[PDB]
C-alpha cells in the first residue's frame, strides 16, 4: 500500500506506489 511519506502532486503519477493525489494537492 501507499507509504506514510509526504509528497506534493498534480496527478496520481507524481505519487508513490498504491497512492492517489488527494484534493489538498498531496499524496495519500
The coordinates were experimentally obtained by: NMR
* Residue at grid coordinates 500500500: 1
Task: Give residue limits of the domains in the chain.
Answer: 1-28
* DSSP per-residue codes, 1-28: ---S---B-SSGGGSPTT--B-TTSBB-
Name, in order, each residue with C-beta under 8 angstroms of 9's C-beta and a sequence gap of 6 or more. 15, 21, 25, 26, 27
Q: Determine contact, residues 11/21, Cβ cutoff 8 Å.
A: yes
* Residue at grid coordinates 492517489: 20
Q: The C-alpha cell of 16 is what?
A: 508513490
What residues does 27 pair with on adjacent strands?
A: 21
Q: Determine contact, residues 28/4, Cβ cutoff 8 Å.
A: no
Amino acid at each position: 500500500g501507499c507509504p506514510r511519506i509526504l509528497m506534493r502532486c498534480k496527478q496520481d503519477s507524481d505519487c508513490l506506489a498504491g497512492c492517489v493525489c488527494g484534493p489538498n494537492g498531496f499524496c495519500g
